[PDB]
């Protein structure tokens, strides 16, 4: 690992956390503004 | 909205730096709970 997977780990931490705070429009109108490409490659990485 | 997004921009950007034995050693530290409430959110 690294400072930087610390970093990461803390991210999809509070992604989580953030996401139990917002309504069903606040969530699909955040993921709409997320480019298709970064929701792919997490997409990818939390499935594999 | 702005900060969320932040936040998935820097993930994205440390995840594309990652070797594969960092990014999988990653993945098996998040909980299963989590991986299925982000995996959902996002495919939809
Ligand atoms: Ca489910």
Known sequence: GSMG???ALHLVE???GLLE???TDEKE???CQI???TAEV???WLQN
Do not use: N, Q
Request: aromatic share 0%; no cysteine.
């Open 42 to 44: 997490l997409i990818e």
């Open 14 to 16: 509070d992604l989580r």
């Open 35 to 37: 480019p298709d490409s």
């Open 5 to 7: 997977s610390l970093r």
């Open 21 to 23: 705070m917002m309504e």
């Open 29 to 31: 109108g955040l993921r």
